[PDB]
Amino acid sequence: ERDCRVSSFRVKENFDKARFAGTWYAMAKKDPEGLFLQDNIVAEFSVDENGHMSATAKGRVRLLNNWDVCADMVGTFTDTEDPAKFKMKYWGVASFLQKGNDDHWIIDTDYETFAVQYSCRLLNLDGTCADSYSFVFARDPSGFSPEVQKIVRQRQEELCLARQYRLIPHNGYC
Numbered sequence: 774e775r776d777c778r779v780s781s782f783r784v785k786e787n788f789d790k791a792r793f794a795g796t797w798y799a800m801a802k803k804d805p806e807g808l809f810l811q812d813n814i815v816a817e818f819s820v821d822e823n824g825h826m827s828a829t830a831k832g833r834v835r836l837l838n839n840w841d842v843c844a845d846m847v848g849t850f851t852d853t854e855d856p857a858k859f860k861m862k863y864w865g866v867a868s869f870l871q872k873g874n875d876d877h878w879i880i881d882t883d884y885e886t887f888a889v890q891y892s893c894r895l896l897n898l899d900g901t902c903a904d905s906y907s908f909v910f911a912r913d914p915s916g917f918s919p920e921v922q923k924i925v926r927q928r929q930e931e932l933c934l935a936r937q938y939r940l941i942p943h944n945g946y947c
């Protein structure tokens with residue numbers, strides 16, 4: 774019944790870049806294909822005078838060579854016709870870190886407690902996503918209250934990602 778076509782997903786209504794600024798702690802994530810951020814992920818979003826949103830992300834990555842590295846990532850966001858969907862160009866402080874361009878959608882957020890992000894890096898022919906990632910972020914590293922957990926679960930279901938997230942540890946590795 775429920776549609777899994779990317780184009781039908783609801784996003785944050787009238788998203789406010791300025792209220793979203795600040796520190797966000799990744800609590801859980803749905804990983805995409807390939808090398809990705811493993812844990813201890815913390816993001817810091819900022820918005821300049823002109824309305825340009827950017828962010829820096831910190832996190833542990835396990836290199837294919839088994840080297841554990843703390844990646845210092847940077848991302849710049851381009852606005853689209855939907856204030857909640859952005860085009861994010863990203864790169865690392867270190868030249869060997871992954872560089873790319875990914876859609877960045879804010880599915881939902883109350884700005885003060887939690888946020889649900891999503892990106893579809895490859896569309897199936899039917900319109901569903903073939904390779905996606907999603908992060909559940911929190912303002913507080915202690916997490917959310919049960920009431921908030923219930924809203925986050927619903928958003929997960931809405932993206933057709935229910936049961937596919939794993940909790941992320943924070944142990945100050947970076």
Ligand SMILES: CC1=C(/C=C/C(C)=C/C=C/C(C)=C/CO)C(C)(C)CCC1
Nearest residue numbers: 808809810828830834846847848863871
């Ligand atoms: C920039 C950035 C994002 C994505 C960073 C990525 C996609 C990092 C990938 C790390 C690579 C895979 C490490 C390779 O060793 C997130 C969405 C957290 C939000 C704001 C900052």
